[PDB]
Amino acid sequence: DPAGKAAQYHKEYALFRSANMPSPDKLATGVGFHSFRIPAVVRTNTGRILAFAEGRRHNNRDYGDINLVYKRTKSPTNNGENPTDWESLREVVGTGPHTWGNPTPVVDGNTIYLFLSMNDGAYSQNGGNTLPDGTKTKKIDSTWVGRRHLYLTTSTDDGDTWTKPVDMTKTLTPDGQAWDAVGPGNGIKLSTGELVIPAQGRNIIGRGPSGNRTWSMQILKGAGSEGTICQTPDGKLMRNDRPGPMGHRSVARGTLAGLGPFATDNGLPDPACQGSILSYNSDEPARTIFMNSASTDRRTAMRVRISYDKDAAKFNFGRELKDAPLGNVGNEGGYSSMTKTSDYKIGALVESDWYEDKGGEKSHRCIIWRRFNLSWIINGPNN
Numbered sequence: 001d002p003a004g005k006a007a008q009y010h011k012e013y014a015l016f017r018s019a020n021m022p023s024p025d026k027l028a029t030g031v032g033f034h035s036f037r038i039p040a041v042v043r044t045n046t047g048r049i050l051a052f053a054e055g056r057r058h059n060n061r062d063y064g065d066i067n068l069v070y071k072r073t074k075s076p077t078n079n080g081e082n083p084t085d086w087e088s089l090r091e092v093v094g095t096g097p098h099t100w101g102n103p104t105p106v107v108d109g110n111t112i113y114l115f116l117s118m119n120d121g122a123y124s125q126n127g128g129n130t131l132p133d134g135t136k137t138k139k140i141d142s143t144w145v146g147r148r149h150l151y152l153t154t155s156t157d158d159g160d161t162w163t164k165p166v167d168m169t170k171t172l173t174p175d176g177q178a179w180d181a182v183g184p185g186n187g188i189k190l191s192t193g194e195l196v197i198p199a200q201g202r203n204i205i206g207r208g209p210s211g212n213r214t215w216s217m218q219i220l221k222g223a224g225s226e227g228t229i230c231q232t233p234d235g236k237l238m239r240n241d242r243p244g245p246m247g248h249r250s251v252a253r254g255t256l257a258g259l260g261p262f263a264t265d266n267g268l269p270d271p272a273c274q275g276s277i278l279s280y281n282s283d284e285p286a287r288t289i290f291m292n293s294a295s296t297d298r299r300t301a302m303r304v305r306i307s308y309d310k311d312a313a314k315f316n317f318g319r320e321l322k323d324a325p326l327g328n329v330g331n332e333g334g335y336s337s338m339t340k341t342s343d344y345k346i347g348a349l350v351e352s353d354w355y356e357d358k359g360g361e362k363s364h365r366c367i368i369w370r371r372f373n374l375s376w377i378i379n380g381p382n383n
């Protein structure tokens, strides 16, 4: 890989700063957030970078009052290089005491589509969880009020503003389903122009002229809840999903006509956590980038890898992110999202956990923004 001859570049700093950190991220209304989790990042066709997250208002839990927040780079050309290159925190949607989350964006010409999940504020995945008013949640169920919804919002002004989210659950989530997830992380635009958004048990396929899409479900057998999608260099689709049990990623391949079986990929250990994947380039040699925690049991083993295979069958060892660690962000590791930047870097959002209450709800979570070039990956000491 000729990119391995270039000087290695990496830079890293916190982008979503939890309430306990200096200069914590707050909305202009003064609403702050205990934790930020569940990153998503895209480069728009202007070069601007849009970074999304869940702003978890009172604690780090997945339920309760959670708003879908974002930042953009201040210009289309600054590539997110420095902290001051990013705008202040904004909100896509925060209505009610509800959970709004699972940001799953895809760029489509001059429109950015953002899928997201939602649940009523009185419900959680497991039920019985304590809320700030002293009540306990109900368990997410198959009722309209109690089941996870799927929403879509759009921007046609480079992320500056977002349309009121539209509930797509009735057409883009299977009937009878209770829990659900879209992404989180990103969707893609295929070489043939369709949009593909990964979701629990299914892909969501957008067809139509750029910026005027209509969506349908591609139901999958054996897919995970938190999936990634990526058109590999051979032109095929690949789902690379978070497994149910800890162990390894679960991967399937196919086309818009259907995917083959999901199988455990023993080359990609995973602790049952979200991962991210990115088609980096089409020219020679074509590359797919993958990021996750490369450990069957912990989220603190973040690793970024390259595959040169046309089907992304094999990834290299790659680079452990801890080689370029940050010391004032807690313990890095968790969900991630990657984009290419205009200046030939990979930009990655990565969760980090201050862990002050260990795994309890009071531990503050923040999100790191990393940029690095291919050479940094290729030249890793164990690669």
Ligand SMILES: O=C(O)[C@@]1(O)C[C@H](O)[C@@H](O)[C@H]([C@H](O)[C@H](O)CO)O1
Residues within 6 Å of the ligand: 038, 062, 125, 181, 225, 226, 272, 273
């Ligand atoms: O960090 C996790 O592990 C998390 O809890 C965070 C997400 O907000 C949540 O929606 C998702 C879900 O619980 C699993 O995918 C099982 O359905 O996972």
